[PDB]
């Protein structure tokens, strides 16, 4: 009956629970212990990128920690050369409201997608001289809040009609629809050997998901409000989390459970973007303060701040080989820290 | 100049994209942003028809004006998601149909939802276009039973013109502050013709506003 | 893409002509046009230079004054103005694509070509090797000479290699020192280092034989080189 299967779930979840807290030795700020700490590392901004003339809200660095695409609201997703501040492209876009934008690995590509409920991947290599839209991957009844790109062929994008999809860009059609994920989801962060990719949503809840399969391997919780950043940690087997209670949370995909939370009493705004460091040390988030603080991830506390931005941090991202890191703005400033 | 040849040419290049960018936010900083609000089925068809899925965007001119309006109806997700990619247009023209008082009631979902975006955060000095449609089937629904038929909070006469200016008045006492925005309200029908020149007294207010913040008088 | 050119014919000595280009099938304006020369006998001569949106114009010292380049981008047409024609000028003239920016090609169409006959510093680059005979299915080594180091500090090494098949324009190998341009096999393959370059070809076949001239883009005016021709 109805009553039988809420109990059988609500019992379930006592279970699940009571299995979580058991392997719960310890946590992690009990064993990073009796270790030196990364130190109060600050950095300066090394470039400025000028050109928009909108609030940015996405940038993704290309593989070779050289190009870099952001996008705006100005209806403009532009290609930059980090080294020199070159305008490498300057792609117009047909809708000008805008979420989330990728690089593929390959650099062969870009996609874009927001509130007109449609991913766009254009070709930056093209016999003539321009960028050309690919396909259009129409099927998302919500807003796009992210996509990530497997392959030259293959595109993960999350909605806010509280699904993830995975998308064939050639026949343009979804291999596999991931649902089951109260509210709607913002964020995601494919694994860096692309067989799993995780995604937050409004329901404070973060769930990972198998590619293949199509099924939610592991669901987690703890955040207070609605999720908004996401990545993975370098191992892959960890990844952290920024919501709109001023926190920042690390998981852990082989202990199913919350490793420690990031915060500070005199941060109350929401986090918009996050990311980590190579070696995973340290922990890349951007707030709603006009800020982006340096968390080291072992231990719980601010290894530095950068600021810098005159309005909120709506996106930032750490090269591959770590180079520098890159904070896009409301102010339409994106600034490469070193 | 220690710079190659090609890499002369891909300032160059740089250069032209930043001259095209520049002429591109002037030509948009010459348009007026409005955004399109509430409920389907009530009037928002009779009002976008006077002139010119996600996002169904029109663009319409009036005395050498440019208007870009957004509807974004058709979200049906959570907004405070997606709200602030609005911060900063124009006005917002927010369509409520009369008639709507009795068919789980229209008109307090309608009030729930002015109260919650003339009252937030991103839209605290933006002005409101408060679009009452419908007004020819209102007069035939009070002519067929008064307002009092399922609100016995009011305890006014029966007529047309009382119990609109009543909805009127509950309407634009939704809002807290009083003391930074400017509700605008118009009262039409399916067949107007006027109504394109009060969003226009509309905006070429909030556009003096502006203007007066820019300097600092305001 | 096709870059079909018009105009050309017998001037006799001092007179005047307007070499014409009309470009198809891609991005014209985006594009920074070249005009290279070809003696009925000798190698490719670099002409003239214009930018995207008719910036910086570049000319050989041989050819200053006398010669000007004008682009049509609406029209889609690329001029070449010539007066004063000396007996020297008779030659094939190509119109030459080029676009500029990080990781960029440039270099990577050619045109058909046209003729034209009248009656009658620099870097140095030139390869000692020439009329080399060799069999499909082996290897070949062709290198070239700077007269200095082409290795920018940016680091890019600014060496192109061409293939002039018989009977049809020159098309690009190699954009750059060890980087393989499109729809050109993988047994092609530039190398090199500081001041000496070479090509190596693994295993070739029988229609990949012709003059293979190296060109540098390091400096202004763009010089190109002595051909190394193959034959069976």
């Known amino acids: 009956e109805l009553d039988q299967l809420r109990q059988e779930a609500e019992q379930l979840k006592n279970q699940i629970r009571d299995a979580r807290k058991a392997c719960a030795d310890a946590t992690l700020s009990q064993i990073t212990n009796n270790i030196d700490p990364v130190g109060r590392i600050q950095m300066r901004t090394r470039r400025t990128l000028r050109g928009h003339l909108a609030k940015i809200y996405a940038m993704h660095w290309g593989t070779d920690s050289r190009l870099l695409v952001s996008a705006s609201q100005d209806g403009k997703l532009i290609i930059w050369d980090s080294y020199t501040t070159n305008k490498v492209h300057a792609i117009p876009l047909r809708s000008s409201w805008v979420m989330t934008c990728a690089y593929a690995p390959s650099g062969n590509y870009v996609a874009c997608g927001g509130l007109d409920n449609i991913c766009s991947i254009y070709n930056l290599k093209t016999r003539e001289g321009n960028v050309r839209v690919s396909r259009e991957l129409a099927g998302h009844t919500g807003y796009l809040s992210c996509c990530r790109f497997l392959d030259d062929n293959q595109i993960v994008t999350s909605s806010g009609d509280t699904t993830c999809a995975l998308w064939d860009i050639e026949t343009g059609q979804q291999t596999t629809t991931f649902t089951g994920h109260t509210g709607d989801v913002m964020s995601l962060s494919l694994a860096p050997d692309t067989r799993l990719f995780v995604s937050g949503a409004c329901d404070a809840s973060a769930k990972l998901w198998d590619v293949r399969e199509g099924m939610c391997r592991q669901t987690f919780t703890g955040h207070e409000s609605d999720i908004n950043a996401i990545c993975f940690f370098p191992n892959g087997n960890a990844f952290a989390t920024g919501s709109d209670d001023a926190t920042c949370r690390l998981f852990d995909l082989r202990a199913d459970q919350e490793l420690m939370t990031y915060s500070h009493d005199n941060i109350i705004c929401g986090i918009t973007s996050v990311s980590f460091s190579k070696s995973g040390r340290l922990l890349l988030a951007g707030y709603d303060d006009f800020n982006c603080n340096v968390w080291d991830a072992l231990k719980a506390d601010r290894a530095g701040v950068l600021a810098g931005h005159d309005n909120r941090v709506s996106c930032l991202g750490v090269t591959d080989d770590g180079m520098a890191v890159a904070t896009g703005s409301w102010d339409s400033f994106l600034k490469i820290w070193n | 100049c220690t710079l190659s040849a090609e890499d002369k040419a891909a300032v160059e290049r740089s250069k032209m994209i930043d001259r095209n960018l520049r002429e591109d936010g002037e030509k948009a900083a010459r348009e007026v942003k409005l955004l399109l609000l509430g409920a389907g089925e009530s009037g928002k068809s009779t009002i976008v028809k006077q002139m010119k899925t996600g996002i169904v965007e029109t663009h319409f001119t009036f005395k050498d004006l440019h208007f870009k309006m957004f509807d974004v109806g058709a979200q049906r997700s959570e907004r405070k998601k997606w709200i602030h990619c609005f911060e900063g247009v124009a006005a917002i023209i927010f369509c409520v149909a009369l008639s709507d008082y009795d068919l789980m009631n229209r008109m307090h979902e309608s009030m729930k939802l002015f109260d919650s975006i003339c009252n937030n955060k991103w839209f605290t000095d933006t002005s409101i276009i408060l679009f009452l449609n419908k007004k020819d089937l209102f007069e035939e629904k009070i002519k067929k039973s008064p307002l009092t038929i399922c609100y016995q909070e009011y305890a006014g006469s029966n007529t047309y013109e009382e119990a609109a200016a009543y909805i009127q008045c509950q309407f634009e006492d939704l809002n807290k502050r009083k003391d930074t925005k400017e509700i605008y309200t118009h009262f039409t029908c399916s067949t107007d013709t006027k109504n394109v020149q009060f969003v226009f007294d509309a905006v070429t207010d909030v556009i003096i506003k502006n203007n007066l913040k820019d300097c600092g008088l305001f | 893409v096709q870059l079909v050119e018009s105009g050309g014919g017998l001037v006799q000595p001092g007179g005047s002509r307007k070499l014409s280009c009309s470009a198809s099938?891609?991005?014209?304006?985006?594009?920074?046009m070249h005009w290279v020369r070809q003696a009925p006998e000798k190698g490719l001569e670099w002409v003239a230079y214009?930018?995207?949106?008719?910036?910086?114009?570049y000319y050989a010292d041989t050819v200053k004054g006398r010669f000007t380049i004008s682009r049509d981008d609406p029209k889609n047409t690329l001029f070449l103005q010539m007066t004063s024609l000396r007996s020297e000028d008779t030659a094939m003239y190509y119109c030459?694509?080029?676009?500029?920016?990080?990781?960029?090609?440039?270099?990577?169409?050619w045109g058909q070509g046209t003729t034209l006959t009248v009656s009658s510093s620099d870097i140095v680059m030139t390869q000692a090797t020439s009329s080399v005979p060799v069999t499909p299915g082996e290897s070949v080594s062709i290198s070239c000479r700077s007269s200095?180091?082409?290795?920018?500090?940016?680091?890019?090494?600014?060496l192109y290699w061409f293939l002039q098949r018989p009977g049809q324009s020159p098309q690009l190998l190699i954009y750059?020192?060890?980087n393989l341009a499109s729809g050109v096999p993988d047994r092609f393959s530039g190398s090199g280092s500081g001041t000496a370059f070479t090509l190596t070809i693994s295993r070739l076949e029988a229609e990949d034989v012709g003059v293979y001239y190296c060109?540098?883009?390091?400096?202004?005016?763009?010089?190109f080189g002595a051909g190394t021709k193959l034959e069976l």
């Open positions: 030459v694509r080029s676009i500029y920016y990080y990781g960029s090609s440039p270099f990577d169409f």
């Open positions: 099938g891609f991005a014209f304006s985006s594009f920074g």
């Open positions: 214009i930018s995207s949106g008719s910036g910086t114009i």
């Open positions: 200095k180091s082409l290795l920018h500090s940016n680091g890019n090494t600014y």
């Open positions: 750059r020192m060890s």
């Open positions: 060109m540098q883009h390091l400096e202004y005016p763009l010089t």
